[PDB]
Design an enzyme around this catalytic site. Sequence first.
Site, mmCIF file in Angstrom:
data_model
loop_
_atom_site.group_PDB
_atom_site.id
_atom_site.type_symbol
_atom_site.label_atom_id
_atom_site.label_comp_id
_atom_site.label_asym_id
_atom_site.label_seq_id
_atom_site.Cartn_x
_atom_site.Cartn_y
_atom_site.Cartn_z
ATOM 1 N N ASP A 1 0.877 -1.146 0.000
ATOM 2 C CA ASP A 1 0.000 0.000 0.000
ATOM 3 C C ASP A 1 0.933 1.220 0.000
ATOM 4 O O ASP A 1 0.702 2.195 -0.703
ATOM 5 C CB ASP A 1 -0.909 0.050 1.250
ATOM 6 C CG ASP A 1 -1.911 -1.117 1.313
ATOM 7 O OD1 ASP A 1 -2.882 -1.099 0.558
ATOM 8 O OD2 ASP A 1 -1.709 -2.029 2.117
ATOM 9 N N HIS B 1 2.974 2.667 3.396
ATOM 10 C CA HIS B 1 2.581 3.354 4.616
ATOM 11 C C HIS B 1 3.619 4.460 4.858
ATOM 12 O O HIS B 1 4.212 4.570 5.923
ATOM 13 C CB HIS B 1 2.466 2.337 5.775
ATOM 14 C CG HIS B 1 3.656 1.398 5.812
ATOM 15 N ND1 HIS B 1 3.700 0.218 5.152
ATOM 16 C CD2 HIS B 1 4.872 1.563 6.497
ATOM 17 C CE1 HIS B 1 4.904 -0.314 5.426
ATOM 18 N NE2 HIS B 1 5.633 0.475 6.237
#
Length: 137
Positions: free
Chosen positions: A14, A16
């Site tokens: 993703d 982070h």
Amino acid sequence: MEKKTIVLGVIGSDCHAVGNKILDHSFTNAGFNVVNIGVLSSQEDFINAAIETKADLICVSSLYGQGEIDCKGLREKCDEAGLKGIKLFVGGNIVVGKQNWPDVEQRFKAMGFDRVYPPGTSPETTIADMKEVLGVE
């Protein structure tokens, strides 16, 4: 061999705020079946999600929230031998510690049928997801 069932849980690809990219080389990657197993790591409920994927690459970026119980849960998913996913990838695992890491997976990585992601993953890690998990690296 050329399996197309990658399932990722908890954190993961993703980005982070790693400060690299978005980490788009683990999602589709080889344009295979991209599925989410879910948070935690609960192998038992993710056994029902193994009917879904029947993931060869069972990854959970669980920072010990899986526990040594569910860590030994995926050992039982392998030792299941009914459902594949003999190769796991233990994302997170602990925290910051690679060089002289804990006694946790000193003994659990003694078998280390799975690999581990660094405390700051990159797709260099998932270059190895898809590598060693196709069969070997």
